[PDB]
Amino acid sequence: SMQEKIMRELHVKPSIDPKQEIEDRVNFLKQYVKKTGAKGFVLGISGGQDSTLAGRLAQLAVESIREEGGDAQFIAVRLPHGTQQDEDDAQLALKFIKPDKSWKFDIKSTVSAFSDQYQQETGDQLTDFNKGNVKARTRMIAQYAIGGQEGLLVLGTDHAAEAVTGFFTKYGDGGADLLPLTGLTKRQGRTLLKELGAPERLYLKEPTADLLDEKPQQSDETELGISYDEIDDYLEGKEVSAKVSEALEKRYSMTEHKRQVPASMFDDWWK
Amino acid sequence: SMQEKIMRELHVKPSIDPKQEIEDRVNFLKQYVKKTGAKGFVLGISGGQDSTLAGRLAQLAVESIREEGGDAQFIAVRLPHGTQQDEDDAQLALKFIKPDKSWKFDIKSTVSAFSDQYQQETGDQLTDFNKGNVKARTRMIAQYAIGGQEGLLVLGTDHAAEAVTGFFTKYGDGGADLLPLTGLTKRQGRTLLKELGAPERLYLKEPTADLLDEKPQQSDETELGISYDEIDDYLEGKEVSAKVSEALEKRYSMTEHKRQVPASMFDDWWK
Ligand SMILES: Nc1ncnc2c1ncn2[C@@H]1O[C@H](COP(=O)(O)OP(=O)(O)OP(=O)(O)O)[C@@H](O)[C@H]1O
Ligand SMILES: Nc1ncnc2c1ncn2[C@@H]1O[C@H](COP(=O)(O)OP(=O)(O)OP(=O)(O)O)[C@@H](O)[C@H]1O
Ligand SMILES: Nc1ncnc2c1ncn2[C@@H]1O[C@H](COP(=O)(O)O)[C@@H](O)[C@H]1O
Ligand SMILES: Nc1ncnc2c1ncn2[C@@H]1O[C@H](COP(=O)(O)O)[C@@H](O)[C@H]1O
Ligand SMILES: [Mg+2]
Ligand SMILES: [Mg+2]
Structure with missing residues (x-):
């Protein structure tokens, strides 16, 4: 089945044991860092569900490592573009995560400079959509810079519900x-956050990428036109409307390039 | 055999037919663009060998596309960080490539704006090494912005002699x-350029990433500690000294991460 194939490719489980998921995901973080010899982790904290979940797991992983007499640290970093409208949630996230270090890097001046030079070289203004993708790539650079200066690994917040739709910026x-x-559906992620003792405000929060200047904090589902719950039912293998499965299936193939290393002629996935 | 496994993972032919290689690679470019319905390509033209070769292939593919009655175009772009020391070679490359459009975007103001904020936020100054990586990632953003504005795909210049040593900036x-x-050694690449009639200056100069301010135009060979000729003999399946094989293989395993999509607990390669 196409749905069965996708489920298997994305590593989704129809049902999870939240306590055990948390243990294994924290152990993955611990084992990886130790194998590489890195000094900890860095993650941009948005105030959204995914970063809040991933950020607490990272914090629990570095605490465990030190308990074992190792040395590791977690740096949480806010990356507003000027004034973030839901900064309050970010601040709440931080109180809940309790990271070893909380940094900040406002990306407005870089993005501005980039924009101004674009129009000056080309004579075109960047569109809102293209500017939104510049913001997302600038946050990447910012995190890689901190990671590079401090000897840390950059965590990513991708999960099955964002993966299936290719809903993330390429190299952003x-x-x-x-x-x-990886492998968690949107609802399964909320379950993990609930078991961790997170504030309800952080997991009943409407998912948003908030990249646009013309339409702040726009909802994912709006941009998508399918509800995350429909998405979760499909991935968890529940039966859904054919109108649902086909739109999901089509977006998945169209976004395969985001889930693979750059294409070459020796690759067949794109053919 | 380790050498033999790398050769296969990297897609290297111990022996090539240059005219056939040119045809295959120009056809892959035409095949991809048709499948995805993209309008053309964009690529950064450095004045070094690799970008000169890829740029010429690209130009050939779009001219061939337009011949069959299709529509496709090629934008060649200069990405100097202020004044590029070998700008003259880059101008010579454009003259050989003959792209449909040649644009320019100076990344210096974006990089300075970034470095300045870094220091304002952290109180630290970026190392010359880390700042060099910000230049590389900024060039990626510039190309993806032009591609986004115009509807084009971003070509990359990675080849086997860069892949084997992980000598490229991750997400840069x-x-x-x-x-x-993909699959070409440094010398095989020179052979293709000779077949296409390129100016010797473009493949006689020393390869350099030129990202550093403190040590501009530093040659790869200096950074690496091995020459491109020892690298090519290894890749080409020739019996090299124990000292080349050791160094290469050590370097390859340490950079595997640059060659896979981000690691998850479900991936085995990292264990
Ligand atoms: N089939 C493809 N193969 C390879 N690269 C592609 C393909 N289709 C598009 N691209 C590249 O990916 C970019 C789009 O990815 P990006 O991460 O920006 O998603 P987005 O534009 O934010 O949203 P959307 O999901 O609507 O694409 C394009 O501008 C282009 O460079
Ligand atoms: N084993 C690993 N797994 C995943 N990511 C890693 C690993 N080792 C390092 N990294 C990440 O990769 C980055 C290094 O790649 P990058 O392109 O920045 O290379 P570089 O430092 O310019 O050159 P080199 O890596 O050859 O010294 C580090 O900042 C870190 O975030
Ligand atoms: N304003 C922000 N501040 C910090 N990190 C951010 C910000 N926006 C996005 N991120 C990061 O980007 C990731 C993806 O966001 P999203 O598009 O909402 O799924 C988040 O999980 C964060 O790690
Ligand atoms: N000064 C530059 N101007 C334009 N493109 C560049 C510049 N430097 C690097 N690039 C691009 O980056 C790729 C990698 O360069 P290198 O590290 O020299 O192998 C090149 O093949 C170009 O496509
Ligand atoms: Mg998210
Ligand atoms: Mg090169």
Whole structure:
């Protein structure tokens, strides 16, 4: 089945044991860092569900490593573009995560400079959509810079519900070293957050990429036109409307390039 | 055999037919663009060998596309960080490539704006090494912005002699849509340029990533500690000294991460 194939490719489980998922995902983080000899992790904290979940798992992983007499640290970093409208949630996220270090890097001046030079060289203004993708790539650079200066791995927040739709920026939030949330559906992620003792405000929060200047904090589902719950039912193998399965299936193939290393002539996935 | 496994993973032919290689690679470019319905390609033209070769292939593919009655175009772009020391070679490359459009985007103001914020936020100054990586990722953003504005795909110039040593910036120049030079060694590449009639200056100069301010135009061979000729003999399946094989193989395993999508607990390669 196409749905069965996707489920298997994305590593989704129809049902999970939240306590055990948390243990294994924290152990993955611990084992990876130790194998590489890295000094910890860095992650951009948005105030959204996924980063809040991934950020707490990272914090639990570095605490465990030190308990074992190792040395590891977690740097949480806010990356607003000027004034973030839901900064309050970010601040709440931080209180809940309790990271070893909380940094900040406002990306407005870089993005501005980039924009101004674009129009000056080409005579065109960047569209809102293209500017939104510049913002997402700038956050990548910012995280890689901190990671580079401090000897840390960059965590990525991709999970099955964002993966199936290719809903992330190529080499932007998609640019990361490791993925602790792989295989989890949106609802399964909320379950994990609930078991961790997270504030309800962080997991009943409407998912948003908030990249646009013309339409702040726009909802994922709006941009998508399918509900995350429909998405979760499909991935968890529940039966859904054919109108649902076909639109999901089509977007998945169309976004395969985001899930693979750059194409060459020796690759067949694209043919 | 380790050498033999690398050769196969990297797609290297111990022996090639240059005219056939040219045809295959120009056809892959035409095949991809038709499948995806993209309008053409964009690529950064450095004045070094690799970008000169890829740029010429690209130009040939779009001219061939337009001959069969299709529509496709090629934008060649200069990405100097202020004044590029070998700008003269880059101008010579454009003259050989003969692209449909040649644009320019100076990344210096974006890089300075970034470095300045870094220091304002962290109180630290970027190392020359880390700043060099910001230049590379900024060039990626520039190309993806032009591609986004115009509807084009981003070509990347990675080839086997760069892949084997992980000599490219992750999500910097490693960030692209498709790779026309995959499997070619440095010398095989020179052979293709000789077949296409390129100016000798373009493949006689020393390869350099030129990302550093403190040590501009530093040659790869200096950074690497091995020459491109020892690298090519290894890749080509020739019996090299124990000292080349050791160094190469050590370097390859340490950079595997640059050659896979981000690691998850479900991947085995990292264990
Ligand atoms: N089939 C393809 N193969 C390889 N690269 C592709 C393909 N289709 C598009 N691309 C590249 O990917 C970019 C789009 O990816 P990006 O991460 O920006 O998603 P987005 O534009 O934010 O949203 P959308 O999901 O609507 O594409 C394009 O501008 C192009 O460079
Ligand atoms: N084993 C690993 N797994 C995943 N990511 C890693 C691993 N080792 C390093 N990294 C990440 O890769 C980055 C290094 O890649 P990058 O392109 O920046 O290379 P570089 O430092 O310019 O050159 P080199 O890596 O050859 O010294 C590090 O900042 C870190 O975030
Ligand atoms: N304003 C922000 N501040 C910090 N990190 C951010 C910000 N926006 C996005 N991120 C990062 O980008 C990832 C993807 O966001 P999203 O598109 O909402 O799924 C988040 O999980 C964060 O790690
Ligand atoms: N000064 C530059 N101008 C334009 N493109 C460049 C520049 N430097 C690097 N690039 C691009 O980056 C790729 C990698 O360069 P290199 O590290 O020299 O192998 C090149 O093949 C170009 O496509
Ligand atoms: Mg998210
Ligand atoms: Mg090169």
